[PDB]
Amino acid sequence: LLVLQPLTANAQPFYFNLNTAAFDALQRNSAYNWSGQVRLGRRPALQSVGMGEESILLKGAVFPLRRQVGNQEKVVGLEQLEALRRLAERREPLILSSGYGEVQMGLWCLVRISENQSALLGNGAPRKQTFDLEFKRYGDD
């Protein structure tokens, strides 16, 4: 569905599909930095002083008891959102790789992970993990 992959180019990428995270929502804010300068007797002049923050926010839910597709004797894990955390403490931008329009999305650093894990088991294991990731476009040359 979407692919995270870092700049070191040998680290293991993260694959979004129904086995791992499988978001179904995609906010994509994209501002454009037009600065207003108030003139006294007329309309305020607008100047293009940059590009501003473009952000991508991925909603969704991980259910870590639904078995992997085709009943592979293996379930969706509890580890499988903490892999998003380990890939985010690298202090490193990420290439987004979709498969529908443009495929070469830019460098996107990961900013926020916030899961809501509930319907717990006895040892604290959830069986739902509703997350929302939040990226910002790393402005490379």
Partner: protein
Amino acid sequence: MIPQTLTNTNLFIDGVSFAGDVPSLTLPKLAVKTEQYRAGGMDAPVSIDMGLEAMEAKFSTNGARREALNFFGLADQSAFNGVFRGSFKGQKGASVPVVATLRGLLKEVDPGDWKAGEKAEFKYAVAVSYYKLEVDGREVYEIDPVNGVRAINGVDQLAGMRNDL
């Protein structure tokens, strides 16, 4: 399979028998709490086994039974126990004893419309805190809410969820 169906019923409250009293039962609606999982790529939302709903066992009584009205709103839960029994006869007379031992808290008492000529009814409701259904002699359901044992056909299904993780 031979056709079977309910013919008669019975009810026990703390040992004593309501052998001429109860016109109606309701075993608690066993319902799994489903969360609609549709995601990227998949078409229709699937429903996921994510716990059971609130069990509640109605029963009804036509007379003022002191044994039934004793257990309303007690300070201890599971002081009410109750045992619901049925008998399913079959086509060849092989009657099958369906016994459902619950151990809930008695939740609601409403003596309804006391019309003069019409018979009166005392509807009851039981906030079920333990449920155990037996079809013939074998234990089909054993629902512990407060414990981690949801036994379907004698094997714990919540224990199998912990071994998978």
